[PDB]
């Protein structure tokens, strides 16, 4: 009936969803709001829907939290963020579409703070708190998505809003003493020429060595070393980008570390289908947690026909990696509670050239699988072409039927029994240079043969992974009917994808480990769990 609806990913009962909104924790209860069209399978009439959780996995529905109810948001309630004030009170800053269809920034706060589920929200008669006008000269059609606010050393709040001027992307900074009167700062927190619109900006601290989250307003003590992360979703490319840098508190400006530029050349959280992502600080278990919207890769006709569009990926804890060159992401550990009690284990199998090994006894369309690969002869790896710089484009031209020294090896997920349909999540290993000991690990999510229906967007994804192939290669896949979430190298490379198979559904989907490279690769360990369904809104 609905073979592509997910078993444990967040999505509403029906209709269009996009950006996650105002993720927060309050009185030990997680809140996710999200952009939702109450009466269609495409974007429009957008309101904030609302669901609550105590584990980030099972979700209880609530009435729409924020919807048009006043001039300043009469034409729509667009994206925004929750800030937890020092006294413990949550407030929401969000973009409203006003009566002249200009984008403006409004505040909402709880109607009853004793209500843990914060079902009803009221809005200030002073709204909008921040808006375009003749003096600031901000572009009224490119001025949205307020961040969580952070309290500076001088007791004045900061908040940034995504914007642009011509081809230049902006993170417009506003400051405030009381959180009601906001004043525009002359210079923005950062900008970039040529990037285009900066949608859904995020700005947060991270500790230099460690995996715990840092409270957004937390300072770097004469012991503690914090970097800051600026994230932007770019209109232009439909992807999410981040740079690692320092936060000049004197200038109130963000300086990306040498090598970083905040545009399309920057690194991504996810190298597949992933947009409008937003973090929040989970004070209950000390971790920053990242929400991400994954839209459909089916046709709009298929969307309208099935009656829904859009999912959230599984929430992932994030932190700075040891080297400080990238962020590491990993699905929140609560997702592991869905894992069936009886794991399927393979250990010490040799996938010779051209082989595949099927993994039996698992609900293959709804599963979590972790695998370790060990290559024996690294020196047999092919020298990468120095002009091959774009990992996605490599995966596109070198498909799984094209052999190399090391790889393709990995998983074939959501596969039919006779492999009429399959999604390949695999590795290739290249030698960085001739006679070198440095190696390049490529990760591909190939969905060229994921479905017999051609209407589906069957674009392939790629990403290089900063891991030493001398050590075993890690690979985790969350599988859920129409979504595959892949994590290379224990979270250093993430690729979310959407697939819609005709044969590989429910009991008729299968799971294979495989190797089509010239050399043989070992599978040190392969754990495949069936995943139970979550109770979701």
């Amino acid at each position: 009936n609905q073979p592509y609806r997910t078993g444990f990913h967040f999505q509403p009962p029906k209709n269009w969803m996009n950006d996650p909104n105002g993720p927060m924790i309050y009185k030990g209860i997680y809140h996710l709001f999200y952009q939702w069209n109450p009466k269609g399978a495409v974007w429009g009439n957008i309101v904030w829907a609302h669901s609550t959780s105590t584990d980030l996995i099972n979700w209880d529905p609530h009435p729409p939290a924020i919807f048009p109810s006043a001039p300043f948001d009469i034409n729509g309630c667009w994206s925004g963020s929750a800030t937890i004030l020092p006294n413990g009170k949550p407030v929401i800053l969000y973009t409203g579409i006003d009566p002249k269809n200009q984008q403006v920034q409004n505040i909402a706060e709880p109607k009853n703070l004793s209500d843990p589920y914060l079902r009803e929200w009221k809005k200030s008669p002073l709204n909008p708190l921040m808006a375009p006008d003749a003096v600031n000269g901000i572009n009224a059609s490119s001025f949205r998505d307020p961040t969580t606010a952070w309290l500076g050393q001088d007791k004045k709040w900061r908040v940034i809003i995504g914007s642009k001027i011509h081809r230049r992307g902006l993170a417009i900074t506003y400051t405030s003493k009381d959180f009601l009167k906001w004043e525009k700062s002359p210079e923005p927190l950062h900008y970039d020429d040529g990037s285009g619109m900066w949608e859904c900006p995020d700005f947060f601290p991270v500790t230099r060595f460690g995996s715990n989250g840092v409270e957004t307003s937390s300072f770097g003590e004469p012991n503690e070393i914090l970097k800051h992360v600026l994230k932007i979703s770019l209109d232009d490319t439909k992807h999410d980008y981040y740079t690692i840098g320092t936060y000049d508190r004197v200038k109130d400006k963000f300086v990306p570390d040498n090598g970083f530029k905040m545009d399309g050349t920057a690194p991504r959280y996810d190298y597949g289908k992933y947009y409008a992502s937003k973090t929040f600080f989970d004070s209950a278990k000390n971790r920053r947690i990242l929400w991400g919207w994954t839209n459909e890769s089916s046709s709009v006709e298929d969307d309208v026909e099935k009656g829904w569009s859009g999912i959230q990926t599984i929430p992932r804890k994030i932190w700075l990696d040891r080297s400080g060159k990238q962020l590491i992401q990993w699905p929140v550990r609560e997702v592991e509670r869905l894992r069936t009690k009886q794991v399927k284990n393979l250990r010490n199998k040799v996938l010779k050239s051209g082989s595949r090994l099927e993994v039996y006894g698992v609900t293959a369309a709804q599963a979590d699988v972790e695998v370790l690969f060990k290559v024996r002869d690294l020196e047999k790896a092919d020298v990468i072409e120095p002009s091959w710089t774009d990992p996605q484009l490599i995966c596109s031209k070198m498909n799984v039927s094209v052999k190399s020294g090391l790889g393709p090896f990995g998983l074939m997920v959501l596969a039919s029994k006779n492999l009429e349909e399959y999604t390949s999540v695999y590795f290739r290993i290249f030698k960085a240079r001739q006679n070198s000991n440095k190696y390049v690990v490529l990760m591909c999510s190939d969905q060229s043969r994921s479905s017999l229906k051609e209407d589906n967007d069957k674009t392939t994804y790629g990403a290089f992974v900063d891991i030493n192939p001398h050590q075993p290669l890690s690979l985790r896949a969350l599988i859920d009917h129409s979504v595959v979430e892949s994590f290379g190298g224990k979270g250093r490379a993430c690729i979310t994808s959407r697939v819609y198979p005709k044969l590989a559904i429910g009991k008729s989907s299968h799971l294979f480990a495989f190797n089509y490279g010239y050399q043989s690769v070992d599978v040190l360990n392969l754990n495949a769990w069936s995943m139970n369904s979550a109770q979701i809104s």
Binding site: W43, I97, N101, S141, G196, S299, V300, V304
Partner: protein, 146 residues
């Protein structure tokens, strides 16, 4: 000559120019206005395609037409009921990518619906080509707003 330069950066300069000049909103209109004019042009053709498709379904079609004719009907129903209204909302309120999504939607549908016919000239091929070409011009115009 916002119109002139806007139309230079589209897949069909002449179709673009013809369309924008037929709507007085283009004399003084910015790029968002020019995009809305294009959506109207697509809506005007997709309406005709839709009405044409009804006739042939209420007139005993060949066996190899029924399968296409039902798909085309649904395709243009989605274009007129979901895609274009979305694009009008996105352009008017300022989220261009959802207008872009809507334009890429109708471009593929129009082509798809055309290609369902073997011998490869449908009874309303002009309308599919018009809806395909206008949707591509529309995409180009909206790229500017990203």
């Amino acid at each position: 000559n916002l119109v002139e330069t806007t139309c230079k950066n589209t897949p069909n300069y002449q179709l673009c120019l013809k369309t924008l000049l037929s709507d007085k909103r283009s004399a003084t209109g910015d790029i968002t206005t020019l995009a809305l004019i294009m959506v109207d042009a697509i809506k005007a053709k997709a309406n005709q395609a839709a009405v044409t498709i009804s006739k042939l379904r209420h007139s005993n079609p060949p066996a190899a037409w029924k399968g296409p004719l039902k798909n085309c009907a649904f395709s243009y129903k989605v274009i007129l009921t979901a895609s274009l209204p979305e694009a009008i909302e996105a352009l008017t309120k300022g989220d261009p990518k959802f207008a872009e999504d809507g334009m890429v939607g109708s471009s593929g549908d129009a082509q798809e619906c055309e290609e369902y016919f073997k011998g490869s000239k449908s009874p309303f091929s002009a309308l599919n080509i018009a809806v395909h070409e206008l949707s591509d011009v529309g995409r180009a115009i909206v790229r500017n707003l990203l």
